[PDB]
């Protein structure tokens, strides 16, 4: 409900002379501050807010606000107790996923990822209130077999791989490596026919085509195996 790990905001690029009260004053308008931590050395800190709604407005209002020469970086703090669940039946909802995993501990959020048409992608995310609850959920679903629907397809729990697709890798940071500048010596272009570039870029296209051919064959192999399994079980059910 209040001050969850989903309300924790990370703030990077903080000035050298930053104080605990100074950092709290930045988020003064978003009600009472929660857990505030500052690594004065590495120039970053964390702050919990009452609600995810307040935290979202604070992130929006400060994501690139300048503070004493520095362009602050405000993002939601990385969830320590977030899990990825896969092999879900297309009939498992966010609510069913939450009910199911609640037996491992308290749940902050459980979502079933959907495609551009609202159909279950077979994958979901379960964010727990505590890291030992997420560890309990991961251990038990790997050791044993956890089923959410009548069909005996076990949920595949793994720790969630967190990827950033909002801030990314800006040029100001990438150009710190002199190898980036060496690589940018040639501008983005289309490989012209009859050059060293055209000859070898065609070989990369053939290699990429082969990678596609192989990955498509693996999913075909898995499909016929899941069908064969489904057929062998219908015959074994009748004892």
């Amino acid at each position: 409900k209040t001050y969850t790990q989903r309300c924790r905001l990370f703030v990077g690029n903080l000035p050298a002379d930053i104080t605990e009260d100074e950092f709290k004053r930045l988020f003064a308008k978003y009600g009472e501050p929660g857990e505030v931590f500052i690594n004065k050395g590495k120039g970053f800190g964390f702050i919990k807010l009452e609600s995810r709604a307040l935290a979202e407005i604070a992130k929006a209002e400060l994501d690139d606000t300048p503070m004493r020469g520095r362009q602050l970086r405000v993002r939601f703090a990385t969830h320590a107790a977030a899990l990825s669940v896969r092999n879900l039946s297309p009939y498992v909802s966010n609510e069913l996923l939450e009910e199911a995993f609640s037996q491992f501990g308290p749940i902050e959020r459980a979502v079933v990822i959907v495609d551009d048409r609202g159909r279950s992608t077979g994958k979901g995310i379960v964010e727990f209130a505590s890291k030992p609850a997420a560890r309990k959920a991961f251990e038990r679903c790997s050791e044993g077999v956890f089923l959410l629907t009548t069909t005996p397809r076990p949920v595949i729990v793994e720790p969630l791989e967190q990827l950033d697709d909002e801030d990314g890798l800006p040029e100001k940071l990438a150009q710190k490596n002199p190898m980036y500048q060496k690589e940018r010596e040639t501008p983005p272009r289309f490989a012209q026919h009859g050059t060293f570039e055209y000859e070898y870029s065609q070989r990369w296209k053939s290699l990429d085509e082969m990678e596609k051919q192989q990955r498509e064959q693996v999913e075909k192999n898995m499909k016929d195996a899941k069908d064969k399994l489904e057929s062998e079980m219908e015959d074994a059910y009748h004892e």
Binding site: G168, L173, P188, E197, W204, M233
Partner: protein, 242 residues
């Protein structure tokens, strides 16, 4: 520094009253500065509104997401991007700005991002969002027929249409199609299968297939790494010439 009236600051507003007007909706988002493109579907009770900046749209979304109006509770969410592309096989040493510069040859790029992991290292994939669909179609077509190189190293990028996934609203129970398969799947509640039971055998055999698929995918990774390293050596050897 930001870009104004982009598709990323365009909001979808659903569950509106049937008698809603363009002026009525403009007054709803009055707090969030001026609005641009304003669309309203007479029936069905939905529309679009484009705000000046993404930060303003982010605030309007949280402040009005479930605000009740004329008995109905509104639904405010970010509209889907019509000209979004996913770019894979990116070079080592790449940036958001390099992608913005590279893809700007096909049309107006609203945003370009290099997807990075928890350690700030690129994942090999990127996102390129154009102002309009024809610019995205041009990029898709030219990059498949030709070899688009971004940096000195002659490695062409792979440009594919964006597979848009929603990990925020997801699949709520109210939205699930309550068909025969649904009711069959819901006969049994989430549980651990008992050893020696029919479900246990079936599930263990399913786990075996999931593990076998991972081993088969790891084998493809080995084949492509082996072939890639053979080509990379040949490229390095050929540079010693002419």
């Amino acid at each position: 520094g930001e870009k104004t009236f982009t598709q990323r600051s365009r909001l979808f507003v659903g569950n509106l009253p049937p008698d809603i007007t363009e002026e009525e909706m403009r007054k709803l988002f009055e707090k969030y500065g001026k609005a641009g493109e304003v669309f309203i579907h007479k029936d069905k009770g939905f529309g679009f509104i484009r705000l000046e900046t993404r930060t303003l749209a982010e605030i309007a979304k949280v402040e009005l997401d479930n605000m009740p109006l004329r008995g109905k509770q509104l639904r405010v969410r970010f509209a889907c991007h019509s000209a979004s592309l996913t770019v894979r096989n990116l070079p080592q040493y790449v940036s958001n700005e390099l992608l913005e510069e590279a893809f700007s040859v096909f049309g107006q790029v609203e945003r370009a991002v290099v997807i990075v992991d928890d350690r700030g290292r690129p994942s090999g994939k990127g996102i390129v969002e154009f102002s309009g669909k024809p610019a995205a179609r041009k990029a898709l077509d030219r990059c498949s027929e030709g070899s688009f190189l971004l940096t000195t190293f002659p490695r062409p990028v792979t440009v594919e249409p964006m597979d848009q996934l929603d990990d925020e609203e997801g699949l709520p129970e109210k939205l699930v199609i309550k068909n025969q398969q649904f009711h069959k799947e819901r006969e049994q509640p989430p549980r651990f299968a008992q050893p020696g039971s029919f479900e246990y055998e079936y599930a263990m055999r399913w786990k075996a297939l999931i593990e076998m698929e991972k081993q088969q995918q790891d084998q493809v990774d080995r084949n492509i790494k082996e072939a890639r390293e053979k080509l990379e050596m040949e490229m390095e050897a050929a540079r010693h010439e002419h």
